[PDB]
Structures are given as C-alpha cells and as structure tokens.
C-alpha cells in the first residue's frame, strides 16, 4: 500500500461531497473472480445515489468503473494469479468526493497451492 499520488492544483473542489467508504475489504473468491465489500461513510449530504466500484489490472493504467448500488459486488472474468486494483467512490447530486485508497489483490492460482 504505497500512498502518495497527489495532484498539482492550487484550488479546491466542492464543499459538500461524500466521504471515503470505511470497512473497505477485498478478497479473491475465485481465480477468475473477486469479491469486494465496503461500508457507507458516516459523513455525507443526504444519501449516495450509486456506488462506483473501479477495477483494473496492476500495469494497465486503464482504470474502469461499474455501476453498483450495494455494499458487496463480485467482479468475474479475470485472470488467475493476477493482481487487480480496486477503489470505491461516492457519487451524489453534488459530485464525486474523495476517493478511497487503491486496493490491489492477487487472484487464486489454478496451477496449484504452490505457496508464494
């Protein structure tokens, strides 16, 4: 978990945006799928319209986004023993507030239990 990526902006976004979804966990339920579970932020205006769950492969520089309205989503159609980043974002009438820290996780290897 190497955090640091910052932005060179001498300004600030809105003033009423959602917060980072706590209890952000991620585990590979399968060598071709991944289950991600998160919680709702105690801080925020009104209610979150929909939860945006991003997912990408470590070394693609092409993050994606999927529409989700639950506290648990499963992403299938993935490689075996491959790493994948994940991040949750709150989208409300106001706008996309802060973004949770990237959550990279390696999927199960079909080859064998070969300890890594």
Give the start-to-end residue ranges of the domains of the chain.
23-108
Q: Which of 70, 36, 72 is nearest to 50 (CA)?
A: 70
| Residue with the two structure tokens 């693609």 | 60
Alpha carbon distance 25, 43 (integer Å): 19
The architecture of the domain spanning 23-108 is Sandwich (2.60)
Contact 16, 43 (CB under 8 A): no
Other C-beta atoms lying within 10 Å of the C-beta of residue 108: 16
Q: Classify each residue of 20-59 as buried b or exposed e, where b means 16 or more C-beta atoms within 10 Å of its C-beta.
A: bbeebebebeebbebbbbbebbeebeeebeebbbbbbbee
- Structure determination technique employed: NMR
- In the sheet that holds 72-75, the strands lie side by side as 25-30, 33-37, 72-75
- List C-alpha distances in Å: 82 to 2, 8, 49, 72: 19, 32, 32, 21
Using only C-alpha atoms, the chain has a radius of gyration, in whole angstroms, of 16
């Amino acid at each position: 978990g190497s955090s640091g990526s910052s932005g060179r902006v001498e300004t600030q976004p809105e003033v009423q945006l959602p917060g980072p979804a706590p209890n952000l966990r991620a585990y590979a339920a399968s060598p071709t799928s991944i289950t991600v579970t998160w919680e709702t932020p105690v801080s925020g205006n009104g209610e979150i319209q929909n939860y945006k769950l991003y997912y990408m492969e470590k070394g693609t520089d092409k993050e994606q986004d999927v529409d989700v309205s639950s506290h648990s989503y499963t992403i299938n159609g993935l490689k075996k023993y491959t790493e994948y980043s994940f991040r949750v974002v709150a989208y409300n009438k106001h706008g996309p507030g802060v973004s949770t820290p990237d959550v990279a996780v390696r999927t199960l290897s079909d080859s064998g239990p070969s300890s890594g």
